[PDB]
Structure 1
Amino acid sequence: LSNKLTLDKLDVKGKRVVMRVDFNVPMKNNQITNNQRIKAAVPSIKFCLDNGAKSVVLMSHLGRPDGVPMPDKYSLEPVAVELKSLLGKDVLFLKDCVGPEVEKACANPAAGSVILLENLRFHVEEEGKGKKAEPAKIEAFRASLSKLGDVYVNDAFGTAHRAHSSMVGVNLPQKAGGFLMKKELNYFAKALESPERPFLAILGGAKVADKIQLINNMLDKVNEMIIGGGMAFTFLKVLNNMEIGTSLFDEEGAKIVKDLMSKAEKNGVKITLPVDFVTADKFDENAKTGQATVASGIPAGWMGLDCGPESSKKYAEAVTRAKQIVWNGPVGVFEWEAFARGTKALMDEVVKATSRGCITIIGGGDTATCCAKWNTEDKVSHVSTGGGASLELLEGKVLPGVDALSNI
C-alpha cells in the first residue's frame, strides 16, 4: 500500500464515508457463528467517527445469492445488530443498497451516523452475473453506490480478490484502503517475502471451482501442499479413478489435475491427498455416517464430508515438516460434529507446530471460525479475515480491491 491512499491520510472531517467491508460472516440457525470479520472493520469505522466523519455507510455481500434478493436467508440485518454492540453506537440498517430511497437516507445524515446497507449481491450488477447482467445497469449500480459517500474506503480484505462493482467501480475522487486492508497486506508482505521453508499450503473447503484455479501459481511458491476437504475429490477421481459418490466435484478443474500434478513433480512440491473418509448418506448434520478409503470408494449417493484417521496422520506428517504454513479451507464439514474430527486434529497439529516455532497462518471466513470454535486464535501466528484473498497473495497477485485504490 506504499503508494496507495490509506485512511490515515484521508481528511474525513465533515465528509460522508462510503466503506466497503467484508461482513460475509458465517451463519448457522440464522445466527452469526463468528463476528471476527465484523470486529476487524471496527478500527477503521471508529477512526472515521472520531475524526469527524459526517457518516459511515457500510456495504458488503453475504453468501452467494447470485443476484436475487433473498432476505430470508442472506440478509445483513443480523450484522447490523451485531455491529451495534461492537461499536457502542446504533447503526441504521437499510433494506436495499441502491438507489433512490437508499440515496435519500445517505444524502445528508446526522453527524456521526453509521449506516449498514443490505446485501450487495441481491443485485446482479455487483458481480455482475448470476442467476447475465447489462453494462448500462452495471454503470447505474455503481453511480448509485458512489452517491452514498463523498469519500470511499475499502476495508474489505476478505473480498479484495473480487473485481466486483463495490470493490473496483466506486467513482469518488478519494479511494483509500482502510486499516484492516493495511494490516493484512503488511503482514503477508512480510510473511511471503522470504518464507520459512519447508513452506506448506493447506487447501480445503468447498469453493472448489474457484480455488482449484489458484493451485497452478501456488506451486511456484510452496514446497508442500495438503489438498483436503471438498477439494480432494476432483483430484482423487482423476488420478486414482476413485468412486466419489455425490462428493464435491469440479468438471473444469478435473481437466487440469494432471497438469497440476506434473508441475508439482517438476517443482518438487509434495502433494498430500486424503486416503480415507467419513461418509454421509446426505448433506445433513444428522446424516447416517460411514467410513471409506480411496481403495473402497464412496458408495452411490453417499458423500465424503471428512477425512479419516489415516489421512489425519498423513496431514500431521506434512505439518511436522513445515517451518511455515498457510491454511485456507477446513478439511471437513467442521460445523457438524460428525464431520469435525479431521479439522480438529489438523488444528491440534498446527498449534503444536506453532509452539516449536512454525509460522502458522490460518485464513478465511469459515477457516478462521475453526480457530474461534476451538479457541486457538491466540495459539497460531496469524488468523486472517481473508481466505481466497490470502491464497491470491500467495500466488503473487495484486488484489483488484487494492489495485483500484487511489495512488498517493
Structure 2
Amino acid sequence: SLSNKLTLDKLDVKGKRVVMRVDFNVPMKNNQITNNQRIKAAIPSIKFCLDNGAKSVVLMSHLGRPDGIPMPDKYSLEPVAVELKSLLGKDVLFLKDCVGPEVEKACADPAAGSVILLENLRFHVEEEGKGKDASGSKVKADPAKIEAFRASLSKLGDVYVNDAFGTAHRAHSSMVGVNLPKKAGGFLMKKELNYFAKALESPERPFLAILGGAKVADKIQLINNMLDKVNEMIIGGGMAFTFLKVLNNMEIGTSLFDEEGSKIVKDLMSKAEKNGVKITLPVDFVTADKFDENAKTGQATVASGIPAGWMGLDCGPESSKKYSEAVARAKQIVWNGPVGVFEWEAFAQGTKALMDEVVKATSRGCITIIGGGDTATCCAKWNTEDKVSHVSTGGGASLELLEGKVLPGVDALSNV
C-alpha cells in the first residue's frame, strides 16, 4: 500500500539534521538554468523542516548524466545553489563534494538552520553503481566502495527524507542506501503516492485512461495493467495506427506502425471485452506529407484510409468529439501520452482540445492525473499545471508504477 508510507508531516525533525534527496535535475543551456520549476517544487519540504526547528537540511541530488566521473565544468550544481538562495531567502552552503571526511565534518554539527547543498551525486560511480571511464568504456562499481559511499551519505544526517519521485524507480545509493532509522517521503512524494494510490487502489468510477505516445510494444504491460482497473480507455497518438491497421484493415500510409505490437492487439481487445472495458479509438486524422513542423496538411478518416506517402500526426474533429464524450462520463482520469505530435502547433490541436476538456472535467469534481514526461510538459506549455488534480513529476517512474511494479525508492521508505 502506497498510502502507508511515512511522510514528512508525520516526522519529528525538531533539532534533527535532515538529509534530503531532491530532484534538482534542471534544464541548462550552459552557464544558466532555463527552467527552475523543479527547484521551486522542493521549497515546501525544505521550509517545513526549517520552520519546524530542524538543525539543518542537507540537500543531495543529481544533474545530467556524468556517468560516474566528476564533470564540474559541465554538470555542477553550483548554479542551483545560487538559484535556491534567491527562492528560499536563506543562505545556502554549497559543498564541492557529497561524501568524505570534509563533507561529513561540515554536516556533523552545522549552525542551526543551515541549508547545505552537496555536489552532483553522479560524479561518483557508486551512486548509480555503474558508469563510464574517460574512454567511454563501461565501468562497474566496486562493492566495498559502494558500502563506503552509502555509509558516508548516512553520516550526514539523523533522518532521511525522499522527495525525488523521479528517481524512485532506480535502486541507486541515494534512493535505497541511506541507512537511517526514519526514511520518510517529502511533500512532493506524498502527493505522488496519494494520487497514484487512487489510480491503482481505490479510484472513483467511471475510471478513464487516456493512453497516447508513438510506440505500442513498450506500452504492453501498461495497457495490460490498466485494463485490470479502468472502465474506459482512449487509445490515441501514433499508437492507434497499429490498432486500426490490424482490426479495421485501415490503410495508414507512412504513419507509425509497430510490427511487434501488432501481433498482440487482438489479444488486448479480447481482454478489454472480458473485463467490460469500453475502448475508444480515433475515427479521423490530420495528415502530413512528411514528418516535419512545416509539412503540407491533409485530412483523412478510417474509411478513406491515409494516402501513400502520408502519415497521421493528429486526430481530427470527429475524434475530439468522441474523446470529449468519454471525458464527460468520467469521475477519474489518468492521462499518459499526447494524442498527436504536440511539439508542433499544426499537430497539437488534438492534444490541446483534450486538455481543455480535462480541465473542465476537473472543475466539476473529476480527479485528473497527468503522467510525467511529454504529457506533463503539455501542462507547462499551456499553463494548465494548476487546472488539473495532479501533474506527475516522474516520467519513467510514474510509468513503472502504472505498470504494477514496486518502486525501489518507494519500497525503502519507512512504514507508518
| TM-score category of the 2 structures, normalised to the smaller one | 0.7 to 0.9
Q: 1:142 to 1:331 in 2, by over 3 A?
A: farther
CA contact (8 A) 1:24 1:365 kept: no
Please state whether the residue corresponding to 1:326 is helix, strand or coil: strand
> How far apart are residue 325 of structure 1 and its match?
0.9
Q: 1:322 to 1:20 in 2, by over 3 A?
A: same
CA distance in structure 1 between the aligned counterparts of 2:292 and 2:408, rounded to whole angstroms: 36
> How far apart are residue 404 of structure 1 and its match?
0.6
- Between 136-145 and 320-329, the greater mean CA deviation after superposition: 136-145
How many correspondences in the alignment? Answer: 407
Query: What is the CA deviation profile of residues 45-99 of structure 1, one whole-angstrom value per residue up to 9, with x for unaligned ones?
Result: 1122223334322233456676677778866555444433332224345565555
> How far apart are residue 19 of structure 1 and its match?
1.2
CA contact (8 A) 2:3 2:194 kept: no
Structure 1 unaligned blocks of 5 or more = none
Q: 1:286 to 1:197 in 2, by over 3 A?
A: same
Structure 2 unaligned blocks of 5 or more = 132-139
Query: What is the CA deviation profile of residues 207-266 of structure 1, one whole-angstrom value per residue up to 9, with x for unaligned ones?
Result: 977654322112100012223346556656776788989987878766655543332232
CA distance in structure 1 between the aligned counterparts of 2:386 and 2:409, rounded to whole angstroms: 28
Please state whether the residue corresponding to 1:41 is helix, strand or coil: helix
- Between 241-250 and 220-229, the greater mean CA deviation after superposition: 241-250
Query: What is the CA deviation profile of residues 285-316 of structure 1, one whole-angstrom value per residue up to 9, with x for unaligned ones?
Result: 66787777778988999976644545434432
CA contact (8 A) 1:278 1:306 kept: yes
Query: What is the CA deviation profile of residues 96-122 of structure 1, one whole-angstrom value per residue up to 9, with x for unaligned ones?
Result: 555576656655544333233455456
> How far apart are residue 43 of structure 1 and its match?
1.8
Q: 1:227 to 1:35 in 2, by over 3 A?
A: farther
Q: 1:257 to 1:179 in 2, by over 3 A?
A: same
1:265 aligns with 2:266: no
Please state whether the residue corresponding to 1:31 is helix, strand or coil: coil
Query: What is the CA deviation profile of residues 360-380 of structure 1, one whole-angstrom value per residue up to 9, with x for unaligned ones?
Result: 222425434433432333433
CA contact (8 A) 2:332 2:368 kept: yes
Q: 1:301 to 1:177 in 2, by over 3 A?
A: farther
| TM-score scaled by length of structure 2 | 0.75
CA contact (8 A) 1:175 1:405 kept: yes
> How far apart are residue 201 of structure 1 and its match?
0.9
Query: What is the CA deviation profile of residues 4-34 of structure 1, one whole-angstrom value per residue up to 9, with x for unaligned ones?
Result: 4432344434443221223345678987676
> How far apart are residue 156 of structure 1 and its match?
2.2
Q: 1:55 to 1:273 in 2, by over 3 A?
A: farther
CA distance in structure 2 between the aligned counterparts of 1:342 and 1:116, rounded to whole angstroms: 42
Identity %: 98
Q: 1:7 to 1:343 in 2, by over 3 A?
A: same
Query: What is the CA deviation profile of residues 188-209 of structure 1, one whole-angstrom value per residue up to 9, with x for unaligned ones?
Result: 4456554332211122357977
Residue 46 of structure 2 corresponds to which residue in structure 1?
45
Residue 173 of structure 2 corresponds to which residue in structure 1?
165
Larger Rg belongs to: 2
CA contact (8 A) 2:3 2:197 kept: no
> How far apart are residue 326 of structure 1 and its match?
1.3
Residue 127 of structure 1 corresponds to which residue in structure 2?
128
| TM-score scaled by length of structure 1 | 0.76
Please state whether the residue corresponding to 1:402 is helix, strand or coil: helix
CA distance in structure 2 between the aligned counterparts of 1:278 and 1:30, rounded to whole angstroms: 40
Query: What is the CA deviation profile of residues 159-215 of structure 1, one whole-angstrom value per residue up to 9, with x for unaligned ones?
Result: 434433322222223212223323443344456554332211122357977654322
Q: 1:27 to 1:199 in 2, by over 3 A?
A: farther
Query: What is the CA deviation profile of residues 321-344 of structure 1, one whole-angstrom value per residue up to 9, with x for unaligned ones?
Result: 323211133334434434432221
CA distance in structure 2 between the aligned counterparts of 1:161 and 1:15, rounded to whole angstroms: 28
CA contact (8 A) 2:200 2:229 kept: no
Q: 1:162 to 1:243 in 2, by over 3 A?
A: farther
Q: 327, 336, 344: which one pairs with 1:328? A: 336
Q: 1:247 to 1:107 in 2, by over 3 A?
A: farther
CA distance in structure 1 between the aligned counterparts of 2:262 and 2:409, rounded to whole angstroms: 29
CA distance in structure 1 between the aligned counterparts of 2:194 and 2:54, rounded to whole angstroms: 26
- Between 340-349 and 52-61, the greater mean CA deviation after superposition: 52-61
Q: 1:15 to 1:309 in 2, by over 3 A?
A: same
Q: 1:215 to 1:83 in 2, by over 3 A?
A: farther
Query: What is the CA deviation profile of residues 348-407 of structure 1, one whole-angstrom value per residue up to 9, with x for unaligned ones?
Result: 111232344433222425434433432333433333434554555556665432321124
CA contact (8 A) 1:34 1:369 kept: no
CA distance in structure 1 between the aligned counterparts of 2:27 and 2:248, rounded to whole angstroms: 34
Residue 110 of structure 2 corresponds to which residue in structure 1?
109
CA distance in structure 2 between the aligned counterparts of 1:18 and 1:227, rounded to whole angstroms: 42
- Between 260-269 and 244-253, the greater mean CA deviation after superposition: 244-253
CA contact (8 A) 2:207 2:333 kept: yes
- Between 301-310 and 159-168, the greater mean CA deviation after superposition: 301-310
Q: 1:359 to 1:244 in 2, by over 3 A?
A: same
1:380 aligns with 2:381: no
Q: 1:72 to 1:49 in 2, by over 3 A?
A: same
Residue 174 of structure 1 corresponds to which residue in structure 2?
182
- Between 183-192 and 42-51, the greater mean CA deviation after superposition: 183-192
Q: 1:56 to 1:301 in 2, by over 3 A?
A: farther
CA distance in structure 2 between the aligned counterparts of 1:65 and 1:211, rounded to whole angstroms: 29
Q: 1:38 to 1:256 in 2, by over 3 A?
A: farther
Please state whether the residue corresponding to 2:130 is helix, strand or coil: coil
> How far apart are residue 346 of structure 1 and its match?
1.0
CA distance in structure 2 between the aligned counterparts of 1:329 and 1:344, rounded to whole angstroms: 12
Q: 1:223 to 1:127 in 2, by over 3 A?
A: farther
- Between 278-287 and 119-128, the greater mean CA deviation after superposition: 278-287
